[PDB]
């Protein structure tokens, strides 16, 4: 997260870190057995780490659970990044408490202008690399579809939205992918792609989760 602030220990209790020997992508806990992340975060050998704040220090509230099944969206296109979403089933149910909680899926999509919270352990610099060990948060609005499309002409589908600041300075970045975008208590986006991080007129592009809720509900009930 570039230009964000330290969230504070377990203030984003639905945030998960996907780990394969090291943090590589975020994800969101949607109920005690299921996590959703970005499809481009797919790997076999994923351990889901819940209750994390410093990902390098065992602070006591963590739960580390292996994934037993990953399901990438049936229409994910790695060339366009259209339908960049996947579901991960945990080997055993997470214990839900104050530090570890699920986020609700949306009943409706959000509109341009809605303020959202984006969080992750990704790169904190627009030029250079500095990885934080504690969770960073960013408050950012959903931008209009024409702002989005003008920044990335011919690259935005109806399953994407932009959020951020066209002036730059504040954005998600590498290491944040698959992480949550929550607006009014609902999971509305998944950190997916962008051009560089926090550059002027290059806002972050997010998977629009409200288009996938019946696929999510149906898939988890049958797996
Ligand atoms: Ca930790």
From Swiss-Prot:
Cofactor binding note: Binds 1 Ca(2+) ion per subunit.
InterPro entries, alphabetized: Peptidase_S1_PA, Peptidase_S1_PA_chymotrypsin, Peptidase_S1A, Serine_Proteases_S1, Trypsin_dom, TRYPSIN_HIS, TRYPSIN_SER
Pfam families: Trypsin
Cofactors: Ca(2+)
GO annotation, biological process: digestion; proteolysis
Chief localisation class: secreted
Family annotation (SMART domains): Tryp_SPc
GO molecular function: endopeptidase activity; metal ion binding; serine-type endopeptidase activity; serpin family protein binding
Membrane-traversing stretches: none
Protein's name in the database: Serine protease 1
Species of origin: Bos taurus (Bovine)
Gene name tied to this protein: PRSS1
């Amino acid at each position: 997260i570039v230009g964000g602030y330290t969230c504070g220990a377990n203030t984003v209790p639905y945030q998960v870190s996907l780990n394969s020997g090291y943090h590589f992508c975020g994800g969101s806990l949607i109920n005690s057995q299921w996590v959703v992340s970005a499809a481009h975060c797919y790997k076999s050998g994923i351990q889901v780490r819940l209750g994390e704040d410093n990902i390098n220090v065992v602070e006591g509230n963590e739960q580390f659970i292996s994934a037993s099944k990953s399901i990438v969206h049936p229409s994910y296109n790695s060339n366009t990044l259209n339908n960049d979403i996947m579901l991960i089933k945990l080997k055993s149910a997470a214990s839900l408490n104050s530090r570890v909680a699920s986020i609700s899926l949306p009943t409706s999509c959000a509109s341009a202008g809605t303020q959202c919270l984006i969080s992750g352990w990704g790169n904190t610099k627009s030029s250079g690399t500095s990885y934080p060990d504690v969770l960073k948060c960013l408050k950012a609005p959903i931008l209009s579809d024409s702002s989005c499309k003008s920044a990335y002409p011919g690259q935005i589908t109806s399953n994407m939205f932009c959020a951020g600041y066209l002036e730059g300075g504040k954005d998600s970045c590498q290491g944040d992918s698959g992480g949550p975008v929550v607006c009014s208590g609902k999971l509305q986006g998944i950190v997916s792609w962008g051009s560089g991080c926090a550059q002027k007129n290059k806002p972050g592009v997010y998977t629009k989760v409200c288009n996938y809720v019946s696929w999510i509900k149906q898939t988890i009930a049958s797996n």
